[PDB]
Structure formats: C-alpha cells, structure tokens
C-alpha cells in the first residue's frame, strides 16, 4: 500500500498494476522463471486489494484492462486470465474506456476468449453509450459538459 | 416480446407484451395503470384504426419492427373518440 501510494511508473508509463498484467514484463533468467510468471492473478488481486489505481493509464493510454485482453495465451492459463479480468472489472476498471488511439479493449481484445470474458463482465450503462456516441460523431464537447464529465468523454 | 410506446397527447407509457396476443389485455392493463373507464381505448397505428380482436403482431409491428431500443408509437386517444393529438417530442438544439 505504501509503494502504491507513490504510484511508480516505468519509462512507458506502466504502473505497478500494468506490469503485473502485462505478459511482456521481463523475468530474470535465474530461478525467478520457475515462480514469477506474468500475468499473475494473485499479484493483481493483492494489488487491487491494496488500493492500486485500476483506471490508471500508461503513456500510450492503455489501462490495466487494455493489456490483459491483448494476452496471446487465452486457453493455456485460462484460470489465470479469467481470475484477473474479473478482478479488474470488480475493482472498478472501465470496460469501455479508450487509449490515445481510441481503441476499446473489446476492439483490442484480438482474441475470441478474452472478448467473450470481457463481454460477459461488461456492465452496460447509458453514460458509456452516450459518451461513445459523442466521441464517434466528434461533437464539440468543450465547455458544454460538466468538468467531471470532460474526462469521461476523454477516455470513453 | 414486443415493446410498445403508447402515446396520448403528452402522456407516454412503455409496455412489454408478446407477438401473438390480443389487444384485450393491453387495453385492460392501460386501463389499470391509467385509471380511466375501459371504453375509451382506441389504439391508433400510424393514424389509423385497428381491430380489437386481431393480434398485435399482424397489426403493423413485430419483434423486428418494435424493439426495446426503439419502440413503435401507438396513439391512445380517449373518447370525450377524440382526434389524434400526439404531441411530438421537443426537437434537439441545432448542433454546430
């Protein structure tokens, strides 16, 4: 918890939750390969219980949910992949937010299994649909909406 | 699972029913939730009368036509039958 409250970030904006989610996180060639395998659902669940910023994005804009859907091994460790998508959504990660390239994690799922899991765990809301329609039609939303909703249009 | 947006001047009622059913129970439920005599229900689809015994699936809307995302309007002018005076929704402002 003390380390999370500093919000540590790598070169490419990766928070401590993103690296525990990303499969590209390096593992040392020594005995750490036998234990520390990423993504790990226990690490993500412990970090979310300790108060990790689940909606935090990197420099590219990908959230914690944007990297877990990009996992290229959906069935080999499906027990890990299922137990981490549920944890992120239950923590409060948006299932509709977009990165700087304006890509939904459904669009960046690149996998039938991850898309199925996410769509099962999506909680549909009118605010997300309206914000997606606003962003799709490129409507001028500056100074016409509450300031607490400008960010909402920003990532949706 | 047909979905209807019953209109009467300004009042609007959203109702769920089945494809193959009569409008008898539809008139009865709108009577129950409107607190009006049950003899003034004259349902109108696209400003025309319809039979009170014919199924509503053949009346002009179905599952592919009437949806929860976009229900079909059904005027419900009451006998004082009054003329159809369905007030349209307010137009959105002219976007730049």
């Amino acid at each position: 918890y003390n380390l999370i409250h500093l919000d540590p970030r790598t070169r490419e904006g990766f928070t401590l939750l993103h690296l525990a989610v990303n499969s590209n996180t390096p593992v040392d060639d020594f005995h750490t390969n036998d234990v520390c395998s990423f993504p790990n659902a226990l690490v993500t669940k412990l970090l979310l219980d300790c108060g990790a910023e689940v909606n935090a994005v990197d420099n590219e804009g990908n959230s914690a949910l944007h990297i877990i859907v990009q996992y290229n091994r959906p069935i080999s460790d499906f027990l890990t992949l299922h137990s981490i998508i549920i944890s992120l959504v239950e923590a409060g990660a948006h299932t509709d937010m977009t990165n700087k390239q304006n890509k939904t994690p459904l669009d960046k799922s690149t996998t039938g299994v991850s898309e199925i899991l996410l769509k099962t765990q999506m909680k549909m809301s009118l605010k997300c649909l309206a914000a997606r329609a606003v962003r799709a039609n490129d409507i001028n939303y500056q100074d016409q909406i509450p300031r607490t909703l400008e960010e909402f249009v920003g990532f949706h | 699972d047909v979905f209807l947006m019953i209109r009467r001047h300004k009042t609007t009622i959203f109702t769920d029913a089945k494809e193959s059913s009569t409008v008898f129970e539809l008139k009865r439920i709108v009577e129950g939730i409107l607190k009006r005599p049950p003899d003034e229900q004259r349902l109108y689809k696209d400003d025309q009368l319809l039979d009170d015994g014919k199924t509503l699936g053949e009346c002009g809307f179905t599952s592919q036509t009437a949806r929860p995302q976009a229900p079909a309007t059904v005027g419900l002018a009451f006998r004082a039958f009054e003329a159809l005076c369905i007030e349209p929704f307010s137009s959105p402002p002219e976007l730049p």
Binding site: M124, L126, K127 | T12, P68, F89, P92
Partner: protein
Amino acid sequence: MYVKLISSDGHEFIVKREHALTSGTIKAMLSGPGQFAENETNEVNFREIPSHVLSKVCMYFTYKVRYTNSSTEIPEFPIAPEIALELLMAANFLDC
C-alpha cells in the same frame, strides 16, 4: 408497479418501477419523503431535461432491463448525433 416521469416541457412518461430503479438518481427520488404511495403514479418532476432525452432514457431503461444479461446478440443503442451531448448529461444526472 408503474412510476411516472415528467419532463420540463410538460411531457409525461410512465414506465415500470423495476425498469426505472436501474438509475440511482430516480431510485433516490422515489425513496425519501414524498413517495406518494398510490402504487400507480409515483410521479417525479424533472425540471431540467427536455422531453426527447427523457424518452431516450426510458427507452434505455427498457433496453437494459431486457438485455441485462443475454447472449452475444446485443443490438446497439440507436443514439442520434443530435440527441448526444444532451443525453450524456442526462445519464450523468440519472447515474445510469
């Protein structure tokens, strides 16, 4: 069982109570003082939102109740560009 939603521009909308309790703000409005326990009207007066956005949020209520959990066949919500940026603030107010 049925609640009433009144827009700023005189329009009245009636939807099922379970359909309208999916938004937190309407649930808060129905709770507290002035429940008006007639079990048929429970009328809430929205003094700000226009009629078209209220119609769209009622359609959203029905749409979400129908598709709260289903198969992959989830049809998209038909949001017009003109009704957006006014339904977004409406959903913010309603906490939909």
